[PDB]
Design a protein around this ligand. Structure first.
Ligand SMILES: *CCC(=O)N1CCN(CC)c2ccccc21
Length: 286
């Protein structure tokens, strides 16, 4: 009886989200319920301290009756819905730039605390009516693993997955989130997913057909990754001018750096924020 359900507002990889009202404070919140060694409660509890204007505020973590509840600030819409609703005309470039600038600040903060997301996608980027955008679900992928199917048996999207993950690397760096964010960036600009794979191999070959099949020159160590096969077809790289029109030259330079194959060479969030693409960044209200 601590929270009143108002309405169901969404479904993530692990559980359902309701808008709720805090009985005793009157505050409106988003309450995620997840069913069911395990360091998940410790690690997720630590995210209550990892506060930033571009990270969804984690108000509380409740473990009771073999369910995990996450109490978050209420935000009104995800980026996937906003992109679908903006399909006819597209999100305006100054708003795209504002959103990427803010998302990079959120990543830079978590990354500075050694915390990775590992599963960024438009569905977990939430916006308000004031012009802010925030990252949701930090910590959940690491705590629980990324399953093939969600709790409601939907396919977990591969579209934003970094190539080192797809090639079976055992160690993920903060670069995995930069890759994902660069995919989201291209999708806002073109109104179409950059790499819409429908299996792990289809995802990898879509990446290869655009960026070129990687070799030891662009990506040292690539031919010794666990899931690398010498039989991969060898596609030549496309020019970014084709990939994301009509992004200007600064956006294209930034995007190419977010999409470097080698996780060691891929631009950091901190470095991306200093990119000349942001020289004229503003905060428009949609
Ligand atoms: C704690 C609530 C939560 O995890 N999130 C991320 C998932 N969703 C549903 C899209 C959400 C919406 C509004 C506010 C927070 C959250």
């Amino acid at each position: 009886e601590n929270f009143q359900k108002v309405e169901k507002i969404g479904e993530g990889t692990y559980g359902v989200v309701y808008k709720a009202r805090n009985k005793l404070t009157g505050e409106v919140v988003a309450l995620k319920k997840i069913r069911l060694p395990s360091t998940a409660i410790r690690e997720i509890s630590l995210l209550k301290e990892l506060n930033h204007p571009n990270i969804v505020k984690l108000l509380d973590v409740i473990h009771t009756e073999n369910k995990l509840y996450l109490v978050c600030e209420f935000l009104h819409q995800d980026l996937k819905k906003f992109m679908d609703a903006s399909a006819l005309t597209g999100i305006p470039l100054p708003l795209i730039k504002s959103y990427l600038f803010q998302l990079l600040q959120g990543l830079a903060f978590c990354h500075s605390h050694r915390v990775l997301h590992r599963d960024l996608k438009p569905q977990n980027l939430l916006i308000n009516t004031e012009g802010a955008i925030k990252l949701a679900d930090f910590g959940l992928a690491r705590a629980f693993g990324v399953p093939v199917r969600t709790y409601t048996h939907e396919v977990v999207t591969l579209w934003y997955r970094a190539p080192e993950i797809l090639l079976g690397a055992k160690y993920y760096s903060t670069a995995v989130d930069i890759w994902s964010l660069g995919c989201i960036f291209a999708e806002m600009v073109t109104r179409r997913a950059l790499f819409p794979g429908d299996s792990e191999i289809d995802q990898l070959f879509r990446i290869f057909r655009t960026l070129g099949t990687p070799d030891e020159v662009v990506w040292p160590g690539v031919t010794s990754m666990p899931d690398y096969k010498p039989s991969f077809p060898k596609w030549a790289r496309q020019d970014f001018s084709k990939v994301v029109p009509p992004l200007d030259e600064d956006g294209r330079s930034l995007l190419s750096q977010m999409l470097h194959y080698d996780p060691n060479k891929r631009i950091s969030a901190k470095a991306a924020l200093a990119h000349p693409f942001f020289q004229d960044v503003t905060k428009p209200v949609p």
